[PDB]
Amino acid sequence: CQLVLVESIPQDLPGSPSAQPLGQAWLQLLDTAQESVHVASYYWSLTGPDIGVNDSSSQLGEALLQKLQQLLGRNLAVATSSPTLARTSTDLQVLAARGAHVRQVPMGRLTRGVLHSKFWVVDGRHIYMGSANMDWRSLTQVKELGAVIYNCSHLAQDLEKTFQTYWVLGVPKAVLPKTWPQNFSSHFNRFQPFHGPTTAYFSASPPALCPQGRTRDLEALLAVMGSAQEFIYASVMEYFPTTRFSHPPRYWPVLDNALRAAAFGKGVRVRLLVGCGLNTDPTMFPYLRSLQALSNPAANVSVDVKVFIVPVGNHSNIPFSRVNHSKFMVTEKAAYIGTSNWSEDYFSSTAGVGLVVTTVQEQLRQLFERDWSSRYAVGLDGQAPGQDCVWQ
Amino acid sequence: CQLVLVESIPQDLPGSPSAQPLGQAWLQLLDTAQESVHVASYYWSLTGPDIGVNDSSSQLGEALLQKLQQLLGRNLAVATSSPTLARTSTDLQVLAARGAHVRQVPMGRLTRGVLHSKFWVVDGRHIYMGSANMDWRSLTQVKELGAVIYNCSHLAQDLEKTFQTYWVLGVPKAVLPKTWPQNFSSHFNRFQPFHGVPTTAYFSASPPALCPQGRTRDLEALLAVMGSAQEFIYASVMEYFPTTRFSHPPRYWPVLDNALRAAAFGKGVRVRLLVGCGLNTDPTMFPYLRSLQALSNPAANVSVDVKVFIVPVGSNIPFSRVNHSKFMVTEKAAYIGTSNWSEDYFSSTAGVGLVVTQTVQEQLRQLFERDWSSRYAVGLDGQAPGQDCVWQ
């Protein structure tokens, strides 16, 4: 039983701790496959011709594509999608005409939302789960973090059951089941995690897509932050203590309140690192300042916030890239990796999943520290005319 | 049915709107008394020798004190106190030796707390409400706000119910009843408020253990007033802590903060918070205030403004020269209360609160505006070198 953290690193990002490159891990996954692959992906932009192609950064992507064909040359790719982005792409059509069984859940139909989950279960015995969705930009042109597990076959299905929840929906005239039978019921929640020298469990969201025995991603995040007693390391591309894309906008403090409660009532030192990528919302910035203002070393309250700005350089060719897509958190006890950002939708409307495991915590510790003391992480007052994010 | 708001203004200067002086209105109240007065007070220190300071501003204080004897010379005074402050004062003994019935509720024994309520019900038909407890400093050397009601008796017994709760727990070895009988039950809560003056009004008590059936707790009253707000919220409390106080394990407490920010964000409500600054205030309060001020973003229709009210000393008189007033008003209603905004006042410490709606709400509007757009109110980033408040 092995679990490895995987990291996708674009141009730059220099003696520092490092993780295993994600592209080799994906080649890894497609190589070990002997029987079947099950895919949950937000969108599919893997070939390049779907978007501008003259960057030459694309190979890591379509080389990966050929590996897919190998599984279809060896005789079952099972993909699931959403009210998808990059509709011009023909990857799913190619794989369906080549032998892959694909249905898309129109999550907007059911809960106004989207399928933001991105995970793999291969041969029923290996799993991948992380922030890297189906995109070559997620392989070479955006920072990504994830985790992959092999051998542990008795836990490998533990995300398949969710994958299968997604599978049952998306059929024509599909309806939300008010109760999932024992087939989709889970036995690996927060109360009883896995065993083997770590312990781990998965979580799904939203509640309507959570069968019995499934802990919600919100509850997993809250429990991980509550169990923290010295530090809370959070890295999400966007952080909004508010609901998004809801006709009446409403405040949403539960995550924020838990952060501040950990900082104050238990003296936990908390640092929050959020991404800036030319597409972020400037309205996000005041809330971060509202957290940063809590800092007071004389009262044992330690709240520090920074923004991770990655430079576009000569690569303005790629439009939806040059961000920190990684989403994770670590406390001295546990390590949570997630697919969802920190806003109301991911816990009320849009599908998402999250793993939490318990040296791996120290590995992610040093990953975050390298991503935090770095030169691309800047404080709130560092306007920096040469920096390339929108702040107002 | 008449209601007048009363304001105590020390040696300071406000052409500005004004309210009825508190000392003369209080003397009025003791004059109108014919049968009985019931007093709930935090402490009793009205003479100079009560705290041993030789200031002639105390005379008005002792003037009121002398009036008490007249009422007891006219044949009745009933007072209830707490694990009280200024224990050197002998006022309660003086009134007791002349015919006043006094018992002390040992609120520290029962609910961790103190009796912070300050109100009068006189003749069962006139009432006083305010932040001004029994202190001559509250008559001449500290900013105070309150409200008095005449000829509207149907609310006077509703406050007599809470007074009688205090009375019954004032007996020796008294224990909190898990159920208050129908005698203490109230019929004038927020859901059915009251109906001279074309107004509607109601009272609220705290903590829950001292709230009989039909009584809304002050927490719910504040939350309802902020929730019903649609265009603005004026808040003025001497101290504002989104945290517990005097609580052995400190924990965060976001309930009022969440509302203030939920009102600001989800409904575009303009929010201004005015807190008192004195030589004894807690510097740790300031970061949390920034957490509100950082919310400000005119581009997103969120309006959060904070200032601090500092009155200059000139001190000889100890534990004075502050803004001890606590109230809030929205374009619909006006709540004035006896408790500051921190967890204790809504879980442990006794407090009461009036809220009325219909010109009185507009009266409080421009009263606060005279205090906000004012001379003694300064922003967080000012911290002028010469005034007498603690910032670090």
C-beta atoms of B251 and A242 within 8 A:
no
From the list B38, B50, B91, B116, the catalytic residue is: B116
C-beta atoms of A299 and B288 within 8 A:
no
Q: Which of B252, B290, B292 sits opposite A260 (nearest CB)?
A: B252
- The token duo for A234 is 């959070």
Q: Which residue has the tokens 């991404």?
A: A275
Q: Which helix (H) or strand (E) holds B167?
A: helix B156-169
B324 is catalytic: yes
- The token duo for A354 is 């999250």
Does residue A24 sit at the B interface (CB-CB below 8 Å)?
no
**Cross-sheet strand order for the sheet of B351-357:** B200-206, B351-357, B333-337, B327-329, B232-237, B270-277, B303-310, B377-379
- How far apart, in whole angstroms, are the C-alpha atoms of residue A136 and residue B197? 72
User: Is residue A51 one of the residues assigned to a domain?
Assistant: yes
- How far apart, in whole angstroms, are the C-alpha atoms of residue A320 and residue A88? 15
Does residue B284 sit at the A interface (CB-CB below 8 Å)?
yes
Does residue B271 sit at the A interface (CB-CB below 8 Å)?
no
Range of the domain at A49: 2-172+181-378
Which among A259, A264, A284 is the top mutation candidate for probing chain B, defined by the most B β-carbons within 10 Å of its own β-carbon? Answer: A264
- The token duo for A109 is 């139909």
- Shortest distance, CA B252 to any CA of chain A (angstroms): 5
What does the angle CA B103 – CA B127 – CA B125 come to, to the nearest 5 degrees? 100
C-beta atoms of B299 and A283 within 8 A:
yes
How many Cβ pairs closer than 8 A exist between chain A and B?
69
- How far apart, in whole angstroms, are the C-alpha atoms of residue A352 and residue A348? 10
Resolution (A): 3.0
C-beta atoms of A294 and B287 within 8 A:
yes
User: Is residue A388 one of the residues assigned to a domain?
Assistant: no
CB atoms within 10 A of CB A101: 12
Does residue A246 sit at the B interface (CB-CB below 8 Å)?
no
DSSP annotation of B52: T
Residues of chain A neighbouring B269 (CB-CB closer than 8 A): none
- How far apart, in whole angstroms, are the C-alpha atoms of residue A181 and residue A159? 16
Is residue B33 within 8 Å of residue B73, measured between CB atoms? no
C-beta atoms of A301 and B293 within 8 A:
no
- How far apart, in whole angstroms, are the C-alpha atoms of residue B120 and residue B129? 7
- Shortest distance, CA A289 to any CA of chain B (angstroms): 6
Q: How many domains does chain B have?
A: 1
C-beta atoms of A286 and B266 within 8 A:
no
Closest B-chain CA to A298: B284
Closest C-alpha among A89, A81, A91 to residue A163:
A81
- Shortest distance, CA A299 to any CA of chain B (angstroms): 7
Does residue B254 sit at the A interface (CB-CB below 8 Å)?
yes
Is residue B353 within 8 Å of residue B247, measured between CB atoms? no
Task: Sort strands A44-45 and A231-236 into parallel, antiparallel or unpaired.
Answer: unpaired
Is residue B123 within 8 Å of residue B33, measured between CB atoms? yes
Does residue A379 sit at the B interface (CB-CB below 8 Å)?
no
Per-residue exposure over A220-259, b if at least 16 CB sit within 10 Å of its own CB, e if not: bbebbbeebeebbbbbbbbbbbbbbeeeebebbbebbbbb
Does residue A317 sit at the B interface (CB-CB below 8 Å)?
no
Residues 6+ apart with CB under 8 A from A364: A5, A233, A328, A330, A335
B116 is catalytic: yes
User: Is residue B158 one of the residues assigned to a domain?
Assistant: yes
- How far apart, in whole angstroms, are the C-alpha atoms of residue B359 and residue B208? 31
Got the DSSP string for B71-104?
A: HHHT--EEEEE-S-S-TT--HHHHHHTTT-EEEE
Is residue A262 within 8 Å of residue A254, measured between CB atoms? no
Closest A-chain CA to B291: A290
Closest A-chain CA to B258: A253
User: Is residue A355 one of the residues assigned to a domain?
Assistant: yes
**Cross-sheet strand order for the sheet of A269-276:** A200-205, A352-357, A335-338, A328-330, A231-236, A269-276, A302-309, A377-378
- Shortest distance, CA B240 to any CA of chain A (angstroms): 14
User: Is residue B386 one of the residues assigned to a domain?
Assistant: no
C-beta atoms of B262 and A282 within 8 A:
no
Closest A-chain CA to B252: A261
SS3 assignment, position B51 = coil
Phi-psi region of A340 (alpha: psi -120 to 50; beta: other; left: phi over 0): beta
Does residue A297 sit at the B interface (CB-CB below 8 Å)?
no
Q: What are phi and psi of B326, to 5 degrees?
A: -130, 115
Residues of chain B neighbouring A301 (CB-CB closer than 8 A): 287
C-beta atoms of B295 and A282 within 8 A:
no
From the list B38, B161, B307, B324, the catalytic residue is: B324
Q: Which of A265, A293, A392 sits opposite B291 (nearest CB)?
A: A293
Task: State which approach was used to obtain the coordinates.
Answer: X-ray
SS3 assignment, position B3 = strand
User: Is residue B392 one of the residues assigned to a domain?
Assistant: no
Which among A289, A300, A343 is the top mutation candidate for probing chain B, defined by the most B β-carbons within 10 Å of its own β-carbon? Answer: A289
From the list B55, B123, B305, B388, the catalytic residue is: B123
User: Is residue A199 one of the residues assigned to a domain?
Assistant: yes
Write the secondary structure of chain A as one string of H (helix), E (strand) and C (coil): CEEEEEEECCCCCCCCCCCEEHHHHHHHHHHHCCCCEEEECCCEECCCCCCCCCCCCCHHHHHHHHHHHHHHHCCCEEEEECCCCCCCCCHHHHHHHHCCEEEECCHHHHHCCCECCCEEEECCCEEEEECCCEECHHHHCCEEEEEEEECCHHHHCCCHHHHHHHHHCCCCCCCCCCCCCCCCCCCCCCCCCCCCCCCEEEEEECHHHCCCCCCEHHHHHHHHHHHCCCEEEEEECCECCECCCCCCCCECCHHHHHHHHHHHHCCCEEEEEEEECCCCCCCHHHHHHHHHCCCEHHHCEEEEEEEEECCCCCCCCCCCCCCECCCEEECCCCEEEECCCECCHHHCCCEEEEEEECCHHHHHHHHHHHHHCCCCEECCCCCCCCCCCCCC
C-beta atoms of B251 and A261 within 8 A:
yes
CATH code, B116: 3.30.870.10
Q: Which of B254, B265, B291 sits opposite A242 (nearest CB)?
A: B265
Does residue B358 sit at the A interface (CB-CB below 8 Å)?
no
User: Is residue B388 one of the residues assigned to a domain?
Assistant: no
CB atoms within 10 A of CB A85: 16
Does residue A299 sit at the B interface (CB-CB below 8 Å)?
yes
- The token duo for B221 is 């009253």
Residues 6+ apart with CB under 8 A from A304: A269, A270, A271, A272, A292, A295
Got the DSSP string for B196-248?
A: ----EEEEEEESGGG--TTPPBHHHHHHHHHHH-SSEEEEEES-B-SB-SS-S
Residues of chain B neighbouring A253 (CB-CB closer than 8 A): 254, 257-258, 261-262
Q: At what angle do helices B218-228 and B255-266 cross, to 10 degrees?
A: 10
Residues of chain B neighbouring A248 (CB-CB closer than 8 A): 266
Residues of chain B neighbouring A344 (CB-CB closer than 8 A): none
